[PDB]
Specification:
Blueprint: H1 2-13, H2 17-20, H3 39-51, E1 67-68, E2 73-74, H4 81-98
Antiparallel strand pairs: 1-2
Helix pairs in contact: 1-4, 3-4
Length: 121
């Protein structure tokens, strides 16, 4: 569930998801996709295709089980679909986090006509 992914991204990067990423680059948005503007933008792009794998559980509201093994996210729980979901989320939080030094305030609230054709998943 977004709230989970939201907690995840927080303890990971130390930032508020929606605010700093919710509208970032060309992919991060809600119903947006196109050639990624950078490391972070790509992250979102990939986090999208990943979610496109769970055809038996909604990543929006379905809450999966996970923990934090000393500063590290660790899914492992019941069901399988919840897992893919939980695993995608962790790959996003670690992505967005690996490129903090690349976050660009100019993408924070990126227009749209400023984008291009989205890459194929």
């Amino acid at each position: 569930s977004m709230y989970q992914l939201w907690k995840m991204i927080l303890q990971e990067t130390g930032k508020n998801a929606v605010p700093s990423y919710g509208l970032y680059g060309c992919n991060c948005g809600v119903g947006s996709r196109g050639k990624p503007k950078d490391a972070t933008d790509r992250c979102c792009f990939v986090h999208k295709c990943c979610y496109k794998k769970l055809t038996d559980c909604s990543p929006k509201t379905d809450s999966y089980s996970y923990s934090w093994k000393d500063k590290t996210i660790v899914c492992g729980d019941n069901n399988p679909c919840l897992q893919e979901m939980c695993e995608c989320d962790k790959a996003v939080a670690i992505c967005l986090r690996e490129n903090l030094d690349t976050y660009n305030k100019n993408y924070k609230i990126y227009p749209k006509p400023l984008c291009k054709k989205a890459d194929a998943c």
